[PDB]
Chain A
Amino acid sequence: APLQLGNCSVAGWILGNPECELLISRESWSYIVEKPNPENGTCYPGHFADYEELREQLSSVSSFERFEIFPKESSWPNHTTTGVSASCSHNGESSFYKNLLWLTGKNGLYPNLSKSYANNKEKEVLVLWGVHHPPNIGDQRALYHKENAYVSVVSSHYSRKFTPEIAKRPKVRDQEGRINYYWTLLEPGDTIIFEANGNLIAPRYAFALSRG
């Protein structure tokens, strides 16, 4: 049974774009139907890493449930997670992707954080996250309070260290900033470890799934 994505793109649906709860959360599909010009996708501008690969790996799915990998209300006691952006506005008001959280400073501080998740679900788990690139050094300090920040995602198959590239860009939707989006597959049994002292757009929901 095919999966209609409406006016949304694979990026938008899987990220949890606010203009993308739209649609009939489905549990299985054979192929993915997507308009050539979808209007609400990566609402906050930025590059989605390895996008064609993700569309293929998701082209065929037999089971699919969303679940809250890092619960919004218990995972982040030392960080503000409320931040929203006018670029992701639902019904007029500013908002954000439902599956990610924009972690920002709290009490004037952004402490080193590290949270992990072990796959116990007997299914492949799809994990998405972003890294934020502010357009100038004033924004970097305002959001994370440090000029030299790092993000490091490390699992058994994935090992990357992101440093934010801070500079002026051309404007997409009046934003000069970028969030770069990233994704890895989590084997039943594997564990993924996030470490950062800024710029992490942390995962909130992930997906368990299979392909036949």
Chain B
Amino acid sequence: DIVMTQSPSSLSASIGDRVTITCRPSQNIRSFLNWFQHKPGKAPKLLIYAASNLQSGVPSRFSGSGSGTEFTLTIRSLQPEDFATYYCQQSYNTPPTFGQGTKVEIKRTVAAPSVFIFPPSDEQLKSGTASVVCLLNNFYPREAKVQWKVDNALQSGNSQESVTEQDSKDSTYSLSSTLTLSKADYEKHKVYACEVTHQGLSSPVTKSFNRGE
């Protein structure tokens, strides 16, 4: 019944930066406020309980402050592994209620992607579909343009992209782009190429194969 408003909903900050997330209950809740960290695919972890007590295993750069109707989690120097979504949770009246969360991403130095291309397997072609995959490995920033060309003719509408969550050690991203064609469409062409443009590359990088090689 007590409503939790966290701000901001999202932020980006560089390694070493001081990061601050605020939490506002819908009524005064004294010190009965906890902070949780949720790293990708992992069990949520209690970081700070009863407003300011650092929980075991939590690094001392994390600190919680405030009471009453304004609360703050501060990270005094951001590290790559602190990528997570953070939540406040009031423990003042039941049911325990949570803020919508603050997703924290890191800002790091530019890193150009390594590019790899994968042709479709023979097994898949008997099923009538051809997936051609292009991989951009370990780069930062997340922004990247991936264009497909079939016999040097630009493709649209027949590819999908997917991006991994930010890596917990080196703060890079990885990206897949998948060109899907019917087997019949796939056999009309010879040269398949993925062309990647990214801030870390002085000019665009093209990887290619010739069908049946």
Contact = CB atoms under 8 A, between A and B. Distances in A.
Interface of A: 36-37, 170-174, 176
B67 A37 contact: yes
| Dominant SS among interface residues on chain B | strand
Contacts, number: 21
Contacts of A176: 56
A173 B67 contact: no
Nearest to B56: A171
B53 A171 contact: yes
B144 interface: no
Contacts of A170: 34, 46, 49-50, 53, 55
B55 A171 contact: yes
Nearest to B67: A37
B53 A172 contact: yes
B75 to A, nearest CB: 19
Interface in B26-62: 34, 46, 49-50, 53-56
Contacts of A36: 68
A170 B46 CA distance: 8
Contacts of B50: 170, 172
A176 B46 CA distance: 14
A86 to B, nearest CB: 14
A175 to B, nearest CB: 9
21 contacts: A36-B68, A37-B67, A37-B68, A170-B34, A170-B46, A170-B49, A170-B50, A170-B53, A170-B55, A171-B49, A171-B53, A171-B54, A171-B55, A171-B56, A172-B49, A172-B50, A172-B53, A173-B53, A174-B53, A174-B54, A176-B56
Contacts of A173: 53
Given A170-B46, A171-B54, A172-B50, 5 more contacts: A36-B68, A170-B55, A171-B49, A171-B56, A172-B49
Contacts of B34: 170
A173 B48 CA distance: 11
Contacts of B49: 170-172
Contacts of B56: 171, 176
A170 to B, nearest CB: 4
Contacts of B55: 170-171
A113 B46 CA distance: 40
Nearest to B34: A170
B9 to A, nearest CB: 26
Contacts of A174: 53-54
A176 B56 CA distance: 9
A176 B55 CA distance: 9
Interface in B43-94: 46, 49-50, 53-56, 67-68
